[PDB]
Design an enzyme around this catalytic site. Structure first.
Site, PDB file in Angstrom:
ATOM      1  CE1 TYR B 509      -3.805   2.346  -0.320  1.00 31.78           C
ATOM      2  CE2 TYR B 509      -2.810   3.390   1.653  1.00 31.78           C
ATOM      3  CZ  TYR B 509      -3.730   3.430   0.578  1.00 31.78           C
ATOM      4  OH  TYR B 509      -4.542   4.523   0.405  1.00 31.78           O
ATOM      5  CB  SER B 592      -5.964   2.230  -4.785  1.00 35.39           C
ATOM      6  OG  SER B 592      -6.296   3.580  -4.918  1.00 35.39           O
ATOM      7  CE1 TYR B 593       1.675   6.155  -2.240  1.00 31.18           C
ATOM      8  CE2 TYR B 593      -0.092   7.792  -1.882  1.00 31.18           C
ATOM      9  CZ  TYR B 593       1.272   7.482  -2.013  1.00 31.18           C
ATOM     10  OH  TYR B 593       2.200   8.465  -1.911  1.00 31.18           O
ATOM     11  CG  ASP B 670     -11.804   3.544  -9.586  1.00 33.45           C
ATOM     12  OD1 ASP B 670     -12.080   4.458  -8.784  1.00 33.45           O
ATOM     13  OD2 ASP B 670     -10.866   2.743  -9.382  1.00 33.45           O
ATOM     14  CG  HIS B 702     -11.204   2.844  -5.692  1.00 32.79           C
ATOM     15  ND1 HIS B 702     -10.211   2.993  -6.639  1.00 32.79           N
ATOM     16  CD2 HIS B 702     -10.568   3.029  -4.467  1.00 32.79           C
ATOM     17  CE1 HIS B 702      -9.092   3.238  -6.007  1.00 32.79           C
ATOM     18  NE2 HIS B 702      -9.211   3.281  -4.699  1.00 32.79           N
TER      19      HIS B 702
HETATM   20  C1  LIG Z   1      -6.164   3.498   9.442  1.00 31.93           C
HETATM   21  C2  LIG Z   1      -6.952   4.621   8.841  1.00 31.93           C
HETATM   22  C3  LIG Z   1      -8.005   5.334   9.461  1.00 31.93           C
HETATM   23  C4  LIG Z   1      -8.446   6.245   8.548  1.00 31.93           C
HETATM   24  N1  LIG Z   1      -9.423   7.187   8.554  1.00 31.93           N
HETATM   25  C5  LIG Z   1      -9.588   7.883   7.428  1.00 31.93           C
HETATM   26  C6  LIG Z   1      -8.811   7.714   6.254  1.00 31.93           C
HETATM   27  C7  LIG Z   1      -9.096   8.522   5.016  1.00 31.93           C
HETATM   28  O1  LIG Z   1      -9.980   9.378   4.997  1.00 31.93           O
HETATM   29  N2  LIG Z   1      -8.336   8.204   3.954  1.00 31.93           N
HETATM   30  C8  LIG Z   1      -8.548   8.756   2.629  1.00 31.93           C
HETATM   31  C9  LIG Z   1      -9.167   7.672   1.703  1.00 31.93           C
HETATM   32  C10 LIG Z   1     -10.589   7.318   2.185  1.00 31.93           C
HETATM   33  C11 LIG Z   1      -8.349   6.352   1.731  1.00 31.93           C
HETATM   34  N3  LIG Z   1      -9.271   8.228   0.330  1.00 31.93           N
HETATM   35  C12 LIG Z   1      -8.025   8.259  -0.463  1.00 31.93           C
HETATM   36  C13 LIG Z   1      -7.922   7.069  -1.416  1.00 31.93           C
HETATM   37  O2  LIG Z   1      -8.849   6.262  -1.502  1.00 31.93           O
HETATM   38  N4  LIG Z   1      -6.787   6.955  -2.137  1.00 31.93           N
HETATM   39  C14 LIG Z   1      -5.694   7.902  -2.056  1.00 31.93           C
HETATM   40  C15 LIG Z   1      -4.913   7.636  -3.339  1.00 31.93           C
HETATM   41  C16 LIG Z   1      -5.198   6.171  -3.660  1.00 31.93           C
HETATM   42  C17 LIG Z   1      -6.576   5.861  -3.053  1.00 31.93           C
HETATM   43  C18 LIG Z   1      -6.634   4.574  -2.336  1.00 31.93           C
HETATM   44  N5  LIG Z   1      -6.687   3.567  -1.767  1.00 31.93           N
HETATM   45  C19 LIG Z   1      -7.805   6.771   6.266  1.00 31.93           C
HETATM   46  N6  LIG Z   1      -7.638   6.054   7.399  1.00 31.93           N
HETATM   47  N7  LIG Z   1      -6.708   5.048   7.616  1.00 31.93           N
END
Ligand SMILES: Cc1cc2ncc(C(=O)NCC(C)(C)NCC(=O)N3CCC[C@H]3C#N)cn2n1
Ligand SMILES: Cc1cc2ncc(C(=O)NCC(C)(C)NCC(=O)N3CCC[C@H]3C#N)cn2n1
Ligand SMILES: CC(=O)N[C@@H]1[C@@H](O)[C@H](O)[C@@H](CO)O[C@H]1O
Ligand SMILES: *[C@@H]1O[C@H](CO)[C@@H](O)[C@H](O)[C@H]1NC(C)=O
Ligand SMILES: *[C@@H]1O[C@H](CO)[C@@H](O)[C@H](O)[C@H]1NC(C)=O
Ligand SMILES: *[C@@H]1O[C@H](CO)[C@@H](O)[C@H](O)[C@H]1NC(C)=O
Ligand SMILES: *[C@@H]1O[C@H](CO)[C@@H](O)[C@H](O)[C@H]1NC(C)=O
Ligand SMILES: *[C@@H]1O[C@H](CO)[C@@H](O)[C@H](O)[C@H]1NC(C)=O
Ligand SMILES: *[C@@H]1O[C@H](CO)[C@@H](O)[C@H](O)[C@H]1NC(C)=O
Ligand SMILES: *[C@@H]1O[C@H](CO)[C@@H](O)[C@H](O)[C@H]1NC(C)=O
Ligand SMILES: *[C@@H]1O[C@H](CO)[C@@H](O)[C@H](O)[C@H]1NC(C)=O
Ligand SMILES: *[C@@H]1O[C@H](CO)[C@@H](O)[C@H](O)[C@H]1NC(C)=O
Ligand SMILES: *[C@@H]1O[C@H](CO)[C@@H](O)[C@H](O)[C@H]1NC(C)=O
Ligand SMILES: *[C@@H]1O[C@H](CO)[C@@H](O)[C@H](O)[C@H]1NC(C)=O
Ligand SMILES: *[C@@H]1O[C@H](CO)[C@@H](O)[C@H](O)[C@H]1NC(C)=O
Lengths: 728, 728
Positions: B509, B592-593, B670, B702
Site C-alpha cells: 500500500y 490503488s496507492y 471507478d 474502486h
Molecule cells: C487506518 C486509517 C483510518 C483512517 N481514517 C480515514 C482515512 C481517510 O480518509 N483516507 C482517505 C481515503 C478514504 C483512503 N481516500 C483516499 C484514497 O482512496 N486513495 C488515495 C490515493 C489512492 C486511493 C486509495 N486507496 C484513512 N484512514 N486510515
C-alpha cells in the site's frame, strides 16, 4: 535460404511494394509523384516534364497534403493542416495559387477548418463547406457567395455527410455534386436533431487533466435516423446583393411514406440528374430521372421514367444500389443488376422504357462498370477461369453484345489475375493495375489498339529483395460443401511438408459480401506467421460471401451470426481432415465483423478451436449502426426480427468460452464499433466464470491506426498465438 | 489427512470469522442480531429479551437493510431499498414504526430516495435530507418542517456532503450535527457550482443500447474546490407558517483570506459548538469555540478561545486535525496533537488558555481517545512491547497522569495484541474486540472495576475447522535502515523451512500514514498463496508510514513517489539477504496507492522484481482529488510544487518496464481513482514499445467488489503470479 520474413519487417516495412498512383488531368495527360517532384506525363508520346519544383513544403513553409489543379489548368489548391475526423472526413486549410502568374491569392482566402473543397469540373469555380454551410467562389480571388445558412454543428449538415451517411451510404464525406459544365451545384442536406449520441471518453495527452467526452450523432439499429433533403442551385445567376436560391427536389412518394435514404447522385447531362432512393427496409429502391425546366427554374421528375429496383430474397445492391452509367446523350444508361439466375450483370436501360436488356450473362459476376464510350463499355469481372477471386478487364462491343474482349486475361496469366483500371478522360488511355498473384504490375495502354505503351512499375527491386527470404506460397482452391463450390486460401509455410502436422490460424472477416479467398498479393502479418513461425494462415468464404451469386450472398438475410459462423467451423474441420494440420492447435482470429465471427465460433462449443482473438468486435447488433445492421437484419422490433437480434449475441454464448483461450481487444475511441461492445463481452464472461485476456487501446479508433499502437497490437497478438500453439 | 486453504475457500468464504456486532442503546444495554431476531442484552447480568422477531416484517413487504431505534425507545426507523452511491453515501426508503403501538406510521412519511436520516440524541425528533435539503420532524406522525430551499442536484448540498468531503474530510455522507439535548441542529452547506465535472461511461445491462455518461463534481489537484458555509437552527422554534431562521457561524478571518475547508464539528455543550477549519495548504488549522446567547440568538466565537494547530514539517493530522473531547462542563478538552518530538499524544486544553499540557508521552502514539469520564480518559495505543502495529486499551487517571493502566495487554497476551473498544453510554461498560494474532475474541467488561463479565464470541467453531487445514504462520519483525526500525510482516507457507528458496510476493500500500505490518489475523488471498502455492507474501512499512512518529511520516512530505518506493525496493533487497528466498522470483502488487507504488517500483530499473500487478492505480497526482493530493503535495503550480507533480508519474518511467512482466487492472466505473489513470499508463507503454498484460472491469468501481468480479480479478491475478513464478 537462411532468412525469414520477420514481424519486424511487417511493422517497419522492410520489403516495400511500389505503387504507381497517378491522377489524370486531361484526356491524355497525368500526374506522377517521382520522388518529391510532381511530374506531368503525356500518355501518348511518352514524354514528361517537371510541374512542381519546390517539392512538398516550400510555398509558405507548410507540409502539403494535396495538389488539386483546376480542370482548366489556370489555378491550383494547396491543402495543408490536415486534421482527420472519421474514415473519409477531415478538416484543413486551403491556399489557392495562380499558375499563369506563379503567385499566391491572398484576397478572399478559404478559411481554415474547411470540411470539403471541390473545383467545378470545367473552369476554376470552387465550392467549399465550412461550418456546415456551402460557399461558392466564381473567381478564386473574389468573395464567396454563401448559399446555405442553416448549418449547425452536429445537427444540420449542408454539403457534407453526418457520421452514418459517411461510413455507410456514400463511403465519403462529400455531399456536393456539380453539373458537368459547372452551372448547377446539387447538394444534400442532413438533419440530426432527434438522432441520439454515442458518448465516449477521450483521454488525450497526459497534460489534459479531465477527460473529454466526445459526443457523436449515431443511430444504432432501430433508433431515430437522420433525414435528407436534396437541392440544386444555379451558379451563373447568383446575385451579388441578394440571397442565393436553392430549389428543392423532393424524394418520390413511395419513399416519403417511411424513413428513407438518398443513396446515389449522378448527373446524366447538363440538365438531367439521376437520384436513387432507398427505403429503410433496404429491399426497395427508386431512381428518379429529373430534368430541368428553363421556364420555371424547377426540376420535374416524371414518374414514368423512374426505375424501381427490389429484392424478394435479400437487399438491393452489394452494400448500396449500384451507380448508373449514362450514355452521353442522356437518354440511356447501363447498370449492374442481379438477374433471374442470381448473378450480377450489366443491364441496359432506356429512359422511358421498363425493364432492361442483359448484355452480360453466366455463372460469374460483374464487379464494376469502369468506362463508357461511343462504341465500347469497359468492365471488371471475375469471369476468368471460374475463379470468383480474380479480377480482369473486359470490353463489350455495343453494336454486338456477343463481342466481348478480355483486355487483361492473357497479358501475364500466371503472374496477373487481379486487375483494376484507371481510365483517362473520355477513356483514351487506361492504366492497368495488376496486384497478384505475383508482384504488382503497373502498365499503360491506349484504347484504340488495346496495345500496351509502357510499363510504369514492375516491382523489380521488390522481387530481387524477396529472393533472400524464405517466402511462403498461397494455395487457392475450393471445397464442395453441397454441390456448390466454396472458396478458400492458405498461406502455407516455406518448405511445406504434407507429412508434417502444422498449426492452423483462420483469418476471418466473413461478413455479408466479403471475400477472403482471392488472388491478391500481400505482405502482412500472415506472411510472418507462415514464414518465421510455421503456421498455416487459412481463410474461408462461406455462405454470405460475395461475388458468387445471390444464392451464396443472400443466405445470411435476417440471419447474421449463423451460417457465416458455422461454415467457418466447417472450414477448420475440413482443413484438419487433411493430414497436414494439427488438430490440437487451431486458432481463429478476426477484426471487426471477423472479431464478431471469431467470438461466435469460440462460444459455439464446437471443440475445434483451442484459442482465438477478437479485435474491435461487434457483440450485439443493437449496438451497431442502423444503415448497415438493418440492411441484413431488419428492425429490432418484435413485429419484425427482434428474436434474431437477441439470439445472435456474443454475450449469450459466454458459457462456452471456458472451453477456449480468448484474447479480446478494442480501442477506447472507436467511433465505429464502439468500446461498448467489448465491454459487454467482458462483463458476460466475468458473470459466468470464464477467464480470458484483455487489452484496451487508449485513444485508438476502429483501425487501431497509430504507428505505435499498430506495432503494439500485432506484437501482443503474436505472443498470444505463439503461447497457444506452443511455439518459443 | 489434512487439506489446504485454497483460492476456492477464500472466494466462497468457507472459513468464516464470527464478529460480535453490538450496539449500545443505554448505559447498560446493547442490541445484537441473532437470526434476524434482534435481541437486547443487559450488560452486568447477561440476560436478554427478543426486541424484534425475524417473522415480524414479512407483512412489511421488504427486506430491511437497517434498524435505528430512537433514544427514548418509542420508535424505529426501518431502512430499505438501499442503493449505493459512493463509499458512504446511498439513497434509501424509510418507514417509521411505533413501538408503544405495534403499527407503521401511515402519514407524513419520510419520502422515497432519502439521502440521510438521523434522530436527535435524546427524544425522537428526525432530521432527514432529501433532494439536497434538510427537513425536521418533531414527532414521527406530524408534518415535516423545511429548513432549506437552496438544494440542487450536483450543485448545492445542505446537510450532506459532495464527493470530496464524503471521501476525504468526513468519511461520511452526513453533514448534520445535533446538539446533545436536541434543541439545535447544525449543518454544513457545500457549493460545487464551479467544481469541474469528471466524466466516464456506464454501460449497464446488455439491454441498454447507448452507454450513459456519469458526471460527478470532482476537484482534481489545483482545480476549483467546493466552498462551505455553516449553520445552526433552533428546532424548538420552527414556525408552522414561516421558514426556519438559520444563524450562520462565520469562519475565522485567517481562513477566509484564501481557500479553506471545514474539517471537524464537535458539540461541546448545549450552547457550545466547536468548529475546526483547515487552510487549502493543510499545515494551518484553527478551532473556533462558539457560544449561543438567548439575548439575540447569535452564535459568537471568541478569539480569546481560538486554538491554532500548525505543522512545521508536514500537514496537520494523520488525515485531518483530530477530534476534541470535551469534559462535561464544556470548559476543557483533550485532543491528539503531535508533541515536540514528533510523536502523537493526548494534550489537555483549557478554553481561555493558549497552551496545552501533555497527558502522555513516549516513543509510541495514541491512536484514538475512546471515552472520557470524570476520573478516567480511556485511549487506544501501540505502547505495549514497542510494537507499532499492536493495539491495546489504556486508562489515564485525570487526578494523576502517571497512573496509567493497560486494560487489555495482559488478558490473553499470546492470542491478543490488537484491540479496539466500544463503550456504553457514560462509559459504564466496555466491549473489547481482539483482532489477532490469534482468532478474534470478543469480551464484555465493567468499567467500575475492570472486571471481565463474559466472553461474547471466541471463534471456537472456526478453530475446529482449521485443525484439518495446513495454515501459514506469520512473522512480524523489523529491519534497521539508517538506525531506525522499519517493520515488516511475512505470511510464511505451512511447513516452512530455512533451506529452500521460496518465491516472494511483496504486498503493498505504502501511502502516507499506512500500516501493512500488524498483529491482526486475516484469512485472505495471501493466505491461499502461502498455503497452497508455497509463496511467501510479504509487506513492509517504510518512510511515509504512520504510527511511528512524524519523523517517519513527514519524510514523504511534498514528495510522493519517492522514499516509499525506494524502501519497498530496499526491503526486497533486504529480504533476499535472508537465505530462504528465491531472488529470481520476487514480485510486487498492490491496489490503488499500492498500485501506484507497484508501478513506480516496476519502472525503476532496480532488477529486483521480475513481475507485478497494479490494480486501480494512481498514475499522476493531478488526476487524483485535491483534498488528498494537496495534503501531501501542495498545489500543482510553478509557484509551489509543479515540478514534483511532473517527476512522480508512472508514465515518465514507462521505458524501464521492458525489464519486467506487468499486469495493469482497472474498473471502468471507478469514481475514485479514475480509469483515466490506467489509460494514461497504457498510452505511455504503447508509445514506447513495451508489452504488458491488461484487464478492465466493466462497470466495477474502486472496489471491484461484486461477487463475480471479485472471483474473476483474484483468479486472473492468481494465474499471473503462478505463471511468473513458474508454478504449475
Ligand atoms: C487506518 C486509517 C483510518 C483512517 N481514517 C480515514 C482515512 C481517510 O480518509 N483516507 C482517505 C481515503 C478514504 C483512503 N481516500 C483516499 C484514497 O482512496 N486513495 C488515495 C490515493 C489512492 C486511493 C486509495 N486507496 C484513512 N484512514 N486510515
Ligand atoms: C470491395 C468493396 C466494395 C465496397 N462497397 C462498399 C463498402 C462499404 O460500404 N463499406 C463500409 C463498411 C466497412 C462495410 N462499414 C461497416 C463496418 O465498418 N463494419 C460493419 C460491421 C463490422 C465493421 C467493420 N469493418 C465496402 N466495399 N468494399
Ligand atoms: C421544430 C418544428 O418545426 N416544429 C413544428 C412546429 O413548427 C409546429 O408549429 C408544430 C405544431 O403543428 O409542429 C412541429 O413539428
Ligand atoms: C511533351 O512534348 C511535347 C513537345 O514536343 C509537348 O506536348 C510538351 O511540351 C511535353 N509534355 C509533357 C507533359 O512533358
Ligand atoms: C490559418 O489561417 C491563418 C489566417 O487566419 C494563417 O495565418 C495560418 O497560417 C493558418 N494555419 C494555422 C495552423 O493557423
Ligand atoms: C431538422 O429536423 C427537425 C426534426 O428532426 C426539425 O424540427 C427542424 O426544423 C429541421 N431543420 C431543418 C433546417 O430542416
Ligand atoms: C440571406 O438570407 C439569410 C436567411 O436565410 C439572412 O440571414 C441573410 O441576412 C441574407 N443575406 C443577405 C446578404 O441578404
Ligand atoms: C451549361 O449548361 C447549362 C444547362 O443547359 C447552360 O445553362 C449553360 O449555358 C452551360 N454553361 C456552359 C459554361 O457551357
Ligand atoms: C422486403 O423484406 C421484407 C422483410 O423480409 C419482406 O416482408 C418484404 O416482402 C420484402 N420486399 C418488399 C418489396 O418490401
Ligand atoms: C434482565 O432481567 C431483569 C430481571 O428479570 C429485567 O428486569 C430486565 O428487564 C432484563 N433485561 C433484558 C434486556 O432482558
Ligand atoms: C418507497 O417506494 C417503494 C417503491 O419503490 C415502496 O415500496 C415503498 O413503500 C416506499 N417507501 C416510502 C417510505 O415511501
Ligand atoms: C454557490 O456559488 C455560486 C458561485 O460559484 C454562486 O453564484 C451561488 O450564489 C452560490 N449558491 C449558494 C446557495 O450559496
Ligand atoms: C419562505 O417561506 C415562505 C412562506 O412564508 C415561502 O413562500 C417560501 O417558499 C420560503 N422561502 C423560500 C426561499 O422558498
Ligand atoms: C436544551 O438546552 C438548551 C440550551 O440551554 C435549552 O434552550 C433547552 O431548554 C434544553 N432542552 C431540553 C430538552 O433539555
Ligand atoms: C506550509 O507549507 C508551506 C509549503 O511547504 C511552507 O512554505 C509554509 O511555511 C507552511 N505554512 C504555514 C502557515 O505553516
Amino acid at each position: 535460404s537462411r532468412k525469414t520474413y520477420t514481424l519486424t519487417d511487417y511493422l517497419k516495412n522492410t520489403y516495400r511494394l511500389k505503387l504507381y498512383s497517378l491522377r489524370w488531368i486531361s484526356d491524355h495527360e497525368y500526374l506522377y509523384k517521382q520522388e518529391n517532384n510532381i511530374l506531368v506525363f503525356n500518355a501518348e508520346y511518352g514524354n514528361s516534364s517537371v510541374f512542381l519544383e519546390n517539392s512538398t513544403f516550400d510555398e509558405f513553409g507548410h507540409s502539403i497534403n494535396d495538389y488539386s489543379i483546376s480542370p482548366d489548368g489556370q489555378f491550383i489548391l494547396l491543402e495543408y493542416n490536415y486534421v482527420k475526423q472519421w474514415r473519409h472526413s477531415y478538416t484543413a486549410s486551403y491556399d489557392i495559387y495562380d499558375l499563369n502568374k506563379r503567385q499566391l491569392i491572398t484576397e478572399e482566402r478559404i478559411p481554415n477548418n474547411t470540411q470539403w473543397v471541390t473545383w467545378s469540373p470545367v473552369g476554376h469555380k470552387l465550392a467549399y463547406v465550412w461550418n456546415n454551410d456551402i460557399y461558392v467562389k466564381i473567381e478564386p480571388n473574389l468573395p464567396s457567395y454563401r448559399i446555405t445558412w442553416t448549418g449547425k454543428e452536429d445537427i444540420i449538415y449542408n454539403g457534407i455527410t453526418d457520421w452514418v451517411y459517411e461510413e455507410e451510404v456514400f463511403s465519403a464525406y462529400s455531399a456536393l455534386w456539380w453539373s458537368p459544365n459547372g452551372t448547377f451545384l446539387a447538394y444534400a442536406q442532413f438533419n440530426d436533431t432527434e438522432v441520439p449520441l454515442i458518448e465516449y471518453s477521450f483521454y488525450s495527452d497526459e497534460s489534459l487533466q479531465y477527460p473529454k467526452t466526445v459526443r457523436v450523432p449515431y443511430p444504432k439499429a432501430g433508433a431515430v435516423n437522420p433525414t435528407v433533403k436534396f437541392f440544386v442551385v444555379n451558379t451563373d445567376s447568383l446575385s451579388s446583393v441578394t440571397n442565393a436560391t436553392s430549389i428543392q427536389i423532393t424524394a418520390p412518394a413511395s419513399m416519403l411514406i417511411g424513413d428513407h435514404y438518398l443513396c446515389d447522385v449522378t448527373w446524366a447531362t447538363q440538365e438531367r440528374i439521376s437520384l436513387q432512393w432507398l427505403r429503410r427496409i433496404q429491399n426497395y429502391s427508386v431512381m428518379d430521372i429529373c430534368d430541368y425546366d428553363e421556364s420555371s427554374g424547377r426540376w420535374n421528375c416524371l414518374v414514368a421514367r423512374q426505375h424501381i429496383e427490389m429484392s424478394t430474397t435479400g437487399w438491393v445492391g452489394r452494400f448500396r444500389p449500384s451507380e448508373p452509367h449514362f450514355t452521353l446523350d442522356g437518354n440511356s444508361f447501363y447498370k449492374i443488376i442481379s438477374n433471374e439466375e442470381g448473378y450480377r450483370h450489366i443491364c441496359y436501360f432506356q429512359i422511358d422504357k421498363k425493364d432492361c436488356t442483359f448484355i452480360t450473362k453466366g455463372t460469374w459476376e460483374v464487379i464494376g462498370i469502369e468506362a463508357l464510350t461511343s462504341d465500347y463499355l469497359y468492365y471488371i469481372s471475375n469471369e476468368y477461369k471460374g475463379m470468383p477471386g480474380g479480377r480482369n478487364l473486359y470490353k463489350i462491343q455495343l453494336s454486338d453484345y456477343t463481342k466481348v474482349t478480355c483486355l487483361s486475361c492473357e497479358l501475364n496469366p500466371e503472374r496477373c489475375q487481379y486487375y483494376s483500371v484507371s481510365f483517362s478522360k473520355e477513356a483514351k488511355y487506361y492504366q492497368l493495375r495488376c496486384s497478384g498473384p505475383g508482384l504488382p504490375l503497373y502498365t499503360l495502354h491506349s484504347s484504340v489498339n488495346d496495345k500496351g505503351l509502357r510499363v510504369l512499375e514492375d516491382n523489380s527491386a521488390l522481387d530481387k529483395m524477396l529472393q533472400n527470404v524464405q517466402m511462403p506460397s498461397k494455395k487457392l482452391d475450393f471445397i464442395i460443401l453441397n454441390e456448390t463450390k466454396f472458396w478458400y486460401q492458405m498461406i502455407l509455410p516455406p518448405h511445406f511438408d504434407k507429412s508434417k502436422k502444422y498449426p492452423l490460424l483462420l483469418d476471418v472477416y466473413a461478413g455479408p459480401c466479403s471475400q477472403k479467398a482471392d488472388t491478391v498479393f500481400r505482405l502482412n502479418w500472415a506472411t510472418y506467421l507462415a514464414s518465421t513461425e510455421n503456421i498455416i494462415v487459412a481463410s474461408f468464404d462461406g455462405r454470405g460471401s460475395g461475388y458468387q451469386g445471390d444464392k451464396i450472398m443472400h443466405a445470411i438475410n435476417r440471419r447474421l451470426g449463423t451460417f457465416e459462423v458455422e461454415d467457418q467451423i466447417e472450414a477448420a474441420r475440413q482443413f484438419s481432415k487433411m493430414g497436414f494440420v494439427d488438430n490440437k492447435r487451431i486458432a481463429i482470429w478476426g477484426w471487426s465483423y471477423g472479431g464478431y465471427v471469431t467470438s461466435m465460433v469460440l462460444g459455439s462449443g464446437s471443440g475445434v478451436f483451442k484459442c482465438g482473438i477478437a479485435v474491435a468486435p461487434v457483440s450485439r447488433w443493437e449496438y451497431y449502426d442502423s444503415v448497415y445492421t438493418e440492411r441484413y437484419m431488419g428492425l429490432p422490433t418484435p413485429e419484425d426480427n427482434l428474436d434474431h437480434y437477441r439470439n445472435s449475441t456474443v454475450m449469450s454464448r459466454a458459457e462456452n468460452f471456458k472451453q477456449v483461450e480468448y484474447l479480446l481487444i478494442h480501442g477506447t475511441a472507436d467511433d465505429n464499433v464502439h468500446f461498448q461492445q467489448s465491454a459487454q463481452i467482458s462483463k458476460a464472461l466475468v458473470d459466468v466464470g470464464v477467464d480470458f485476456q484483455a487489452m484496451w487501446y487508449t485513444d485508438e479508433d476502429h483501425g487501431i491506426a497509430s504507428s505505435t499502437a499498430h506495432q503494439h497490437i500485432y506484437t501482443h497478438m503474436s505472443h498470444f498465438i505463439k503461447q497457444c500453439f506452443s511455439l518459443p
